[PDB]
Design a protein around this ligand. Structure first.
Ligand SMILES: [N+]
Ligand SMILES: [N+]
Ligand SMILES: [N+]
Ligand SMILES: [N+]
Ligand SMILES: [N+]
Ligand SMILES: [N+]
Ligand SMILES: [N+]
Ligand SMILES: [N+]
Length: 171
């Protein structure tokens, strides 16, 4: 596997109508990682995002908590989703960067966000980050920041696509 990466990891390989699929956004060895802005695309005819309580996402809904970016260094969380098109766009980053650097234990590896999806149809369907004109410096729909607030411009693999029911592929 690549030394440094971001990947959308699914808890399931296959799913029937009515099941929940959990997508974990996992980073690995991102030097001095302090936050991200991610543009994720799914097929809204096949999957429906819901919160941990089961509530359908709205425009401002953030993904669920993972295993990192859960510390109180004044986390900034902003979402701007398009549920009609199947786009989740969210920013999640520590603001208290002086305190974060001082702690000297950067969260370089872990799950930054979790998205739970209701499976609406049993068919092959993918989830991937994708570029968007609203976020021009994205690398395959991903922007990762270090703990100086600087964009990490290279060196990590965007591992894609995540696919449910690949065994049913039409192509
Ligand atoms: N999968
Ligand atoms: N959520
Ligand atoms: N954490
Ligand atoms: N955390
Ligand atoms: N803080
Ligand atoms: N804080
Ligand atoms: N992880
Ligand atoms: N990871």
């Amino acid at each position: 596997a690549p030394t440094s990466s971001i990947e959308i990891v699914l808890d399931k390989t296959t799913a029937s109508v009515g099941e929940i699929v959990t997508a974990s956004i996992n980073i690995k060895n991102i030097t001095n990682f302090s936050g991200c802005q991610l543009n994720m695309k799914y097929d809204p005819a096949v999957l429906q995002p819901v919160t941990s309580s089961g509530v359908a996402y709205t425009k401002s809904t953030m993904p669920g908590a993972g295993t990192i970016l859960n510390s109180d260094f004044n986390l900034r969380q902003v979402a701007d989703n398009d549920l009609e098109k199947g786009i989740l766009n969210f920013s999640k980053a520590y603001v208290s960067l002086d305190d974060y650097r001082t702690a000297a234990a950067p969260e370089q590896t872990g799950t930054v966000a979790v998205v739970k999806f209701k499976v609406l149809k049993e068919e092959t369907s993918s989830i991937s980050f994708e570029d968007t004109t609203s976020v021009p410096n994205a690398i395959d729909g991903t922007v990762l920041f270090d703990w100086n607030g600087d964009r990490i411009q290279s060196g990590y693999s965007v591992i894609q696509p995540a696919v449910i029911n690949l065994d049913m592929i039409a192509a």
